[PDB]
Design a protein around this ligand. Structure first.
Ligand code: A3P
Ligand code: OAQ
Ligand code: NA
Length: 254
């Protein structure tokens, strides 16, 4: 196809929850658009200074209906300046607001089997409080410079996505119910013409068709960020005590 000059603004809003192929999708969108896509990894590896800003936004987000709405929307736009898409926490819970701010953006929902999702979440993002692996995650997190404010953001952005005032994070049934309800609500809320639902394994074709772009030539659809790979990353951070000592060992993930 012909090369055209794409606008550096949010063109794709992905409402999918963590552990549903968001990092692969981030990578895929960057391959298509040649500009950055937001993701939790953007915060962890590039913009830890954003943590307090997302926290403040979530804090004020109950006021979203107006005057207050504009201030909140201004802060969201600021956070996303220079990006062409959003994926993952903390952004995904803001999908409705993002649709208002970026009326010409299309919306994606990444989904998968709910028990596979939960298993993956428990290994990487939200281990049970009595799981010994939680201590290893915390040790690796310290190597990356992530502290309690990072955990607060993770929890608060999950609660915001699930529209809960509090949440028993150690309760699998609660998390599964929230997952199902969240995915159902996205599909009820977003007009179908504006939504593409992507199941893990769908690859380039439906995505590129939805976005009116050619499938990237000779490039396989990304497959990164398995829980196994994250377990290796955690162990290597603990072993070497820095990111820069091992970053070359994780080329597409980081
Ligand atoms: N192209 C692909 N095909 C199949 N699974 C993929 C995939 N890309 C990512 N995944 C899976 O999506 C999950 C990561 O999602 P996210 O980036 O949102 O955290 C991982 O699940 P597992 O942990 O079950 O391996 C990963 O293996
Ligand atoms: C050792 C270190 C790599 N641990 C950091 C972990 C794993 C990456 C990660 C990813 C997400 C969402 O992609 C979230 N999240 O949903 O808040 C939290 C975390 N925290
Ligand atoms: Na990258």
């Amino acid at each position: 196809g012909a090369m055209i000059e794409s606008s550096t603004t949010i063109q794709v809003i992905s409402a999918g929850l963590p552990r549903t192929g968001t990092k692969s999708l981030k990578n895929a969108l960057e391959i298509i658009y040649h500009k950055p896509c937001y993701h939790m990894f953007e915060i962890i590896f590039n913009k830890q200074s954003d943590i307090i800003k997302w926290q403040n936004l979530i804090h004020d987000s109950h006021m979203i209906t107006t005057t207050k709405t504009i201030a909140i929307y201004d802060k969201l736009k600021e956070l996303l300046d220079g990006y062409i898409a959003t994926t993952d926490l903390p952004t995904c819970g803001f999908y409705k607001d993002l649709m208002n701010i970026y009326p010409n953006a299309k919306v994606l929902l990444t989904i998968r089997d709910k028990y596979d999702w939960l298993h993956s979440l428990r290994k990487v993002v939200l281990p049970k409080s009595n799981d010994p692996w939680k201590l290893k995650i915390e040790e690796g997190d310290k190597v990356l410079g992530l502290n309690s404010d990072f955990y607060k953001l993770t929890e608060d952005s999950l609660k915001f996505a699930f529209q809960k005032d509090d949440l028993n994070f150690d309760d699998d049934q609660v998390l599964l119910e929230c997952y199902d309800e969240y995915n159902r609500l996205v599909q009820e809320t977003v007009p179908s013409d504006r939504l593409l639902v992507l199941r893990l394994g769908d690859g380039w074709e439906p995505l590129c068709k939805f976005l009116n772009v050619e499938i990237p030539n000779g490039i396989d659809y990304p497959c990164v960020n398995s829980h196994h790979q994250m377990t290796q990353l955690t162990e290597q951070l603990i072993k070497y005590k820095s990111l820069d000592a091992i970053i070359h060992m994780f080329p597409d993930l980081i």
